[PDB]
């Protein structure tokens, strides 16, 4: 079924120093390490959502460069996250269900409802989130994820690999630092743009409320501080304020009195401009590769080619080549360049004699028939 | 094999090896490499610039080709944007109205026939993606393990070769941490694959050797000064 029951409101809260996690699984102690990866900026304005069912209104939240999920609901309501780009059974979509034991992580072509939820009836939910899914490719089952306690999550999708970070720290978003640990790294290879949480309720639907935090990650650079035990206790957001930039440049948390020259500022470009000649006539390239008979070696003929749109992509469909060595230019990055005049030197030589067609070579064909500078 | 050797591969360990399998056209085997551009790269299968592994590919004209036309292999020709590295797109939408004819179908098929010579024959590609890093190794080579000795021997922990002494460490390695790294970017501690104990890696004893000698025209007896090293070491 597909019923719109869950409603959601929005609010804002300041995330002082939350969202720090280990960039790599290496042990470091009593050393300041600088890393560049997707992190949560300090003192950012994260959105605090409030979901409540009184007994459409909850659109899918964007997933621009990962997201940071946090929730202090100590009743086990959050039971997974939906990941996808269109969520209408057009492409693959990641579905995570964080139940009591042996959670299931499967990506398929789900037909998600407007307001997905789990209907616990105890018996597990009958999967009212999706209508049907048959063309699935990957499935993963492992231990539950983090089975007043605060739970934090970080999801990233880089080069097809989906990285999950999580760490539970008891609280009395308070101040301090709490680094997250890498828990699950699974490959999906799918485009993720929108995401939505799952609220668990019992079924005559039982009323309830839930609150969680959502923060969007950005490519940042942090200066992590490792104590003697090997745990992150402090961090510096080099792009927050110029003081933090000086701290990252000096690689120290204490900056003495003075003037320091930080990185230079540069005005970023607003748009791209492409300027090419207005020639539109096709190229005579379809007059040399489809020739009946070439000339001899001593009488090699060349064809001057000018005033054309040289689309070299039509050459690959004819036949492969035993030698496609391009000197100074790349075979793939060839349709995005201009040339003064291109001459196609066509000649037929013996098979074993194809060794001297190159700069600086010598032989019977090079020194007497055809020489390249 | 990018970053690894095709022959020196049975002596290393890996975290998780994924074998990507797909068949492309013969003349279209040019973009299976980091940083390449083209139709199959930007629309079908893209490799990251930091790729590490062996891109195995061979001809399969005798298996994936039929004279009557083997149309069961498709390829995406049109797409709204370029494909990211290690991304999959199986959607059958038309790149207008509900049907094509004016927008066209982006899922074209290969005309795999034995009549077509080299360049149009199907080629099977097996991308053995390797990730060798500080992550705990789950797959290794056929090399057998030896007994562990502590307190100056050569060690080999999951392919990490070196020379030094091993001592009982008092560190607090996390379950997902396998190797340690000091300021000098060297390995100072490592976790054994068999036993979960942590052992520190310290280089063996060394020091400068300064020879104290008078003029050769006076005598031939010399003195040796082991600077920085105690007499008991």
């Amino acid at each position: 079924q597909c019923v719109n029951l869950i409603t959601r409101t929005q609010s804002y809260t300041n995330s002082f120093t939350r969202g720090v996690y280990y960039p790599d699984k290496v042990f470091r102690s009593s050393v300041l390490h600088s890393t560049q990866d997707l992190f949560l900026p300090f003192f950012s304005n994260v959105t605090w959502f409030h979901a409540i069912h009184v007994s459409f209104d909850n659109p899918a939240l964007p997933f621009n460069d990962g997201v940071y999920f946090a929730s202090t609901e100590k009743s086990n309501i959050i039971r997974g996250w939906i990941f996808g780009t269109t969520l209408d059974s057009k492409t693959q979509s990641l579905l995570i269900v964080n139940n009591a034991t042996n959670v299931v992580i499967k990506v398929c072509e789900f037909q998600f409802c407007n307001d997905p939820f789990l209907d616990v009836y105890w018996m597990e939910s009958e999967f009212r989130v999706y209508s049907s899914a048959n063309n699935c490719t990957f499935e993963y089952v492992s231990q539950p994820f983090l089975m007043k306690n605060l739970r934090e999550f970080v999801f990233k999708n880089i080069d097809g690999y989906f990285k999950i970070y999580s760490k539970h720290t008891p609280i009395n978003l308070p101040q301090g630092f709490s680094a997250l640990e890498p828990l699950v790294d699974l490959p999906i290879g799918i485009n993720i743009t929108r995401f939505q949480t799952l609220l668990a309720l019992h079924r005559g639907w039982t009323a309830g409320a839930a609150a969680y935090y959502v923060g969007y990650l950005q490519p940042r650079t942090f200066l992590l501080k490792y104590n003697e035990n090997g745990t992150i206790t402090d961090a510096v957001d080099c792009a927050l304020d110029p003081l933090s930039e000086t701290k990252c440049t000096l690689k120290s948390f204490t900056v003495e009195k003075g003037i320091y020259q930080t990185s230079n500022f540069r005005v970023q470009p607003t748009e791209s401009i492409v300027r090419f000649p207005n020639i539109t006539n096709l190229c005579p390239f379809h007059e040399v590769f489809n020739a009946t008979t070439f000339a001899s070696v001593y009488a090699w003929n060349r064809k001057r080619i000018s005033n054309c749109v040289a689309d070299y992509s039509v050459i690959y469909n004819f036949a492969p080549f035993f030698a496609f060595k391009c000197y100074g230019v790349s075979p793939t990055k060839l349709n995005d360049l201009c040339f003064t005049n291109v001459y196609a030197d066509s000649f037929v030589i013996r098979g074993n004699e194809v060794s001297q067609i190159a700069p600086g070579q010598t032989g019977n064909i090079a020194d007497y028939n055809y020489k390249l500078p | 094999c990018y970053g690894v050797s095709p022959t020196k591969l049975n002596d290393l360990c890996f975290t998780n090896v994924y074998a990507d399998s797909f068949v492309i056209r013969g003349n279209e085997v040019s973009q299976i490499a980091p940083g390449q551009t083209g139709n199959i790269a930007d629309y079908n299968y893209k490799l990251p610039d930091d790729f590490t592994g062996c891109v195995i590919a061979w001809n399969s004209n005798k298996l994936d080709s039929k004279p009557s036309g083997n149309y069961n292999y498709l390829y995406r020709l049109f797409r709204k944007s370029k494909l990211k590295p290690f991304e999959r797109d199986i959607s059958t939408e038309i790149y207008c109205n509900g049907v094509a004819g004016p927008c066209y179908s982006p899922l074209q098929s290969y005309g795999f026939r034995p009549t077509y010579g080299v360049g149009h024959q199907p080629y099977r590609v097996v991308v053995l993606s390797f990730e060798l890093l500080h992550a705990p190794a789950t797959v290794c080579g056929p090399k057998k393990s030896t007994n562990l000795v502590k307190n100056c021997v050569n060690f080999n922990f999951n392919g990490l070769t070196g020379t030094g002494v091993l001592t009982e460490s008092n560190k607090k390695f996390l379950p997902f941490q396998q190797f340690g790294r000091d300021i000098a970017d060297t390995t100072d501690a490592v976790r054994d694959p068999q036993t979960l104990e942590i052992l520190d890696i310290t280089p063996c004893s060394f020091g400068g050797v300064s020879v104290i000698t008078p003029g050769t025209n006076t005598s031939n007896q010399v003195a040796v000064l082991y600077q920085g090293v105690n007499c008991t070491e």
Partner: antibody
Amino acid sequence: QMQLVQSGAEVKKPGESLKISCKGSGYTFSYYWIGWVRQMPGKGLEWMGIIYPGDSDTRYSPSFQGQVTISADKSISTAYLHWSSLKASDTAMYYCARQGDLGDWILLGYWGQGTLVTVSS
Amino acid sequence: SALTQPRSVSGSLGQSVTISCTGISSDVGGDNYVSWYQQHPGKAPKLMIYDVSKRPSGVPDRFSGSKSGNTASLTISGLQADDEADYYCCSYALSRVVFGGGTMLTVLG
């Protein structure tokens, strides 16, 4: 001397997808190109394509890319044509030709006996 | 491009005829990709003139060709009573052969 022969004439209805063959002898058949020529009654000649018996690198005319296919059996040195979805526009004479030692690979050195395909109902 | 030829021509016994055919293309490697074929009514075609600078074996010496720009000419001397047949020009410079509209050679007497 080198000889070349085709199959007998056939008359089919639109939709039967008949098949014709051509057999040669007296020369290395796998090293000489061979093709077919379409000739409609009362009009000029039309060229469909040729095939190399060694490796069937078939090259078809732009006007015959989706109307007929050319094949050859290298085990017996016999060519084989296959018409898909025969129609009323296929009532033309089919003459085969070979490369020969006279001109280039595309030059038609010799010709066959010809096979008449008359579409009727 | 398409080759152009006169559909019907008129000749006589013992005279000469110069069949004209235009629309010949060219590619890298040469421009002499011109050949002629003869097909008697009710008989298989026979190669008479190819590579007009040369002549085939067995073909009588009364057949000859020439080139002038994009126009070729087939010169036949001594039209006999058995020379009444069709002639076609062929161009294979672009790896694709093309045939003209056909020249029906008729003689008077």
